[PDB]
Amino acid sequence: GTENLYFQSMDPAELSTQLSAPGVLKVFGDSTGTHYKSVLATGTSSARELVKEALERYALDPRQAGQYVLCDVVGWQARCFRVFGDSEKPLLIQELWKPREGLSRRFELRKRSDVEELAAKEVDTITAGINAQARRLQR
Ligand SMILES: [Cl-]
Ligand SMILES: [Pb+2]
Ligand SMILES: [Pb+2]
């Protein structure tokens, strides 16, 4: 519905398999573990559908699916990540885009509220850093 992946100049056959071919996605947690649960997908599976499958498979309750989020995490120590929008197609993004040379990739299930608290956290590490720089200078 808010889909932002598009294929161009393609043929029905290569495009139908691209979207109908099955795949497994290894879905990790925050890093509560180094252990992953394999999640079944196709090129049509949305991030929201795949969050639901992931929670079901973690033995958590899919009712709270809407309060979790799938993340494309580059890192093994995590360094940066991107939150999938609900309508995105993670199986296809997996195929087509990859970590910069040196880094490696993990899809992680994560609670929204843990994501926003991580934004707040990085605003504070920037801001602290600026108030540190400032104090050094004026004294
Ligand atoms: Cl339950
Ligand atoms: Pb499309
Ligand atoms: Pb977890």
UniProtKB/Swiss-Prot annotation:
Ranges for domain Ras-associating: 21-114
Coiled coil spans: none
Superkingdom classification of source: Eukaryota
Family: Belongs to the RADIL family.
UniProt subunit comment: Interacts with RAP1A; in a GTP-dependent manner. Does not interact with members of the Ras family. Interacts (via PDZ domain) with KIF14; is recruited to the microtubule network restricting its interaction with activated RAP1A.
Task performed by this protein: Downstream effector of Rap required for cell adhesion and migration of neural crest precursors during development.
Protein name: Ras-associating and dilute domain-containing protein
Organism: Homo sapiens
Name of the encoding gene: RADIL
